[PDB]
Each structure stands twice: as structure tokens, then as C-alpha cells.
């Protein structure tokens, strides 16, 4: 209700009407009779669902320009237990928010870790980068490895040569940490401990043994 007049200014410069319904709790955008940009109603749609997903207004009107788009990463369907899920998601946020703020700085994006999804606004190269960062953070590899390789790739992309050679020797991301292999004799693990559904009886007390 506070920011809504600014939304009407920022969309009436694109000739898009918008209503804010406060009884059904909705925001609609409509292409009016004076809209010569065919694609701007899509960015108006993204703007109002950004406002619904609780990014603020001066952050969200940077979606009405061509070089910027959204992404909504899905992190809920990756790991099983709630403890490991919230610990990997808090690892995605960081101590004092440092990992998330460094990711926003490197990718030039605006990232919201909310619930069991990750919203992001930015350029498309930054969106590709943050999507791979978030998905590999829900898998087990830590996000500061991706932050390190992002810094390496920025300082590796700002040289005129080495721009058609592969950077895999410069990236420390390739760890080769899969270097265990169990080699027991499989004594019980071949076939032990068949399952029966019926329990055994209990050892009775001395009272039972005497009565």
C-alpha cells in the first residue's frame, strides 16, 4: 500500500495498468490500449511476483529492464533429513551472511534464501552461476569452493590472453576426493540376519522364575 504509487509510475512509463486488490489480496497487471512493447507484460508479471515473494521495491524495479531476470531455485528435494537440510541451507547463507553477500557481489545478483527455495535476480550469466552454486551447495560440496573459483575466474577473465584455453588447471575445484574403497572379506554381509516378524520372548524376573 505504501509503495504502490511508485509501482504505478514505474509501469505507466511502460503503459501497463496494475491494480492492487486489498480484499482478495492480489496484484494484477494488465496490458492497456497504449502498449507497444509486446514483452513488457512478462516483466511486469515478474515484478509483481517479486513483490509477493518479499523483495523490496527499489530492488524489484530492476526487473523492468532487459538485462535482468529472475530465477527461483528449488532446494527442498535434495536431501532427506531436516537436520542436514537446515545445516546445508544455513551453510548457503553463511556465517553473519558472509557467503551470501560475497555471492551477491561476485554474481552481481540479489539472492533470497527463503523457506525451501532460493530466489535470485540478476543478469543471466550471474543467474547461471548462482543456480550451479546453490545446487552444488545442496549437494555436499561447500559454497566457499564456488566463491573461490568465482574469484579465480574473474581474475582469470580479466587478462586478454588465456581466454580460449581451459582454466581447469587454474581452478582448485577439481579435488579428486573419492579415494576410498572398502575391501573386507564379506563374512556376515553376504547373507546374515534373516528377518522374522515375530519377536522373541523376554527373560523373566526372579519373581516369575519362583512363582
Amino acid at each position: 500500500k505504501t509503495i504502490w504509487n511508485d509501482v504505478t509510475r514505474a509501469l505507466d512509463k511502460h503503459n501497463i495498468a496494475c491494480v492492487l486488490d486489498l480484499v482478495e489480496g492480489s496484484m494484477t497487471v494488465k496490458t492497456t490500449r497504449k502498449t507497444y512493447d509486446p514483452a513488457i507484460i512478462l516483466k511486469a508479471r515478474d515484478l509483481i511476483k517479486l513483490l509477493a515473494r518479499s523483495v523490496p521495491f527499489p530492488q524489484a524495479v530492476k526487473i523492468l529492464q532487459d538485462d535482468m531476470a529472475c530465477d527461483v531455485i528449488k532446494i527442498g528435494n535434495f536431501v532427506t533429513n531436516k537436520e542436514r537440510f537446515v545445516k546445508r541451507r544455513q551453510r548457503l547463507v553463511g556465517p553473519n551472511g558472509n557467503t551470501l553477500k560475497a555471492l551477491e557481489l561476485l554474481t552481481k545478483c540479489y539472492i533470497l534464501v527463503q523457506g525451501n527455495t532460493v530466489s535470485a535476480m540478476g543478469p543471466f550469466k550471474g543467474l547461471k552461476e548462482v543456480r550451479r552454486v546453490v545446487e552444488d551447495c545442496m549437494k555436499n560440496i561447500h559454497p566457499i569452493y564456488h566463491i573461490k573459483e568465482l574469484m579465480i575466474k574473474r581474475e582469470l577473465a580479466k587478462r586478454p590472453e588465456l581466454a580460449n584455453e581451459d582454466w581447469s588447471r587454474f581452478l582448485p575445484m577439481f579435488k579428486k576426493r573419492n579415494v576410498a574403497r572398502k575391501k573386507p572379506k564379506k563374512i556376515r554381509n553376504v547373507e546374515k540376519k534373516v528377518y522374522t516378524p515375530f519377536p522373541p520372548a523376554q527373560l523373566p524376573r526372579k519373581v516369575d522364575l519362583e512363582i
Binding site: 528377518y195 516378524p197 515375530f198 519377536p199 520372548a201 523376554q202 523373566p204 524376573r205 519373581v207 516369575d208 512363582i211
Partner: protein, 134 residues
């Protein structure tokens, strides 16, 4: 653990609207028992329909003593009987489908609870010793 039980009144008298006889209640009790209800069912039916509050108050003594003095004694106490038949119902469920590990766990719990009060009833010797749960 929750506190949900019944709150017995401070009075020990018939409630002075209970105009029925102290013997017709006993005749209704032995009639329901001979047609085949457990004593808790006798008590709840007598309370709900023929409004005796509780029969230890309104008759002389409690209704398992009434049934044992009128010849309708149980083979096995009602607690043990209901826990026995719950355990054998879970046992038949387990022989039917054998991937119910939770129902196996509840069978271990029900069998432990069987052994506890079977031990109590045995040292009281309500039921005879050398009683096993088959």
C-alpha cells in the same frame, strides 16, 4: 502423559433421585452378564440407561464381586483378556503381512505389558501359576 480420568463424587450415597431397588440393579447386572458383556460394559450400560451412578455406591459392593457371588466369574481378568486378544490380533496381522516392522514393535510392547500384569495376577494368584500366554 495426560490427565483424563473420571472424577468420582465426594458423596457415597444414592443420589436421592434413584428410586430403583438395590436388588433389581443386581438382577439387571447378572442378566447382562449372562447375555455376555464384560464388567466394564455392564457398568457403562447400567450408568447410561438405568441411571445408577456407580454400583459400588448404589448396590453393596463392586460388580465383579457381584458377578463372582452370583456365579458369573471370569475365566481370566478383563484387563488380561483384552490385552491377550489385542496381542493375538496383532500376531495374526503379522502372519498376514510380514513387512510391518512398526507392528512388530507394538507387539513387543503389548507382550511386555501382558507379562507385567500376568506376573502381578500370578503372585496374587487370581489365575493359577503355570500360566504362560501360549
Amino acid at each position: 502423559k495426560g490427565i483424563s480420568s473420571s472424577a468420582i463424587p465426594y458423596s457415597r450415597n444414592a443420589p436421592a433421585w434413584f428410586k430403583l431397588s438395590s436388588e433389581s440393579v443386581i438382577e439387571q447386572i447378572v442378566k447382562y452378564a449372562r447375555k455376555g458383556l464384560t464388567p466394564s460394559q455392564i457398568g457403562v450400560l447400567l450408568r447410561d440407561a438405568h441411571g445408577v451412578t456407580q454400583a459400588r455406591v448404589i448396590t453393596g459392593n463392586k460388580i465383579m464381586r457381584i458377578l463372582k457371588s452370583n456365579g458369573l466369574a471370569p475365566e481370566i481378568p478383563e484387563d488380561l483378556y483384552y490385552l491377550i486378544k489385542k496381542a493375538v490380533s496383532v500376531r495374526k496381522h503379522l502372519e498376514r503381512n510380514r513387512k510391518d516392522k512398526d507392528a512388530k514393535f507394538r507387539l513387543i510392547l503389548i507382550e511386555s505389558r501382558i507379562h507385567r500384569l500376568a506376573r502381578y495376577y500370578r503372585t496374587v494368584a487370581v489365575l493359577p501359576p503355570n500360566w504362560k500366554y501360549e
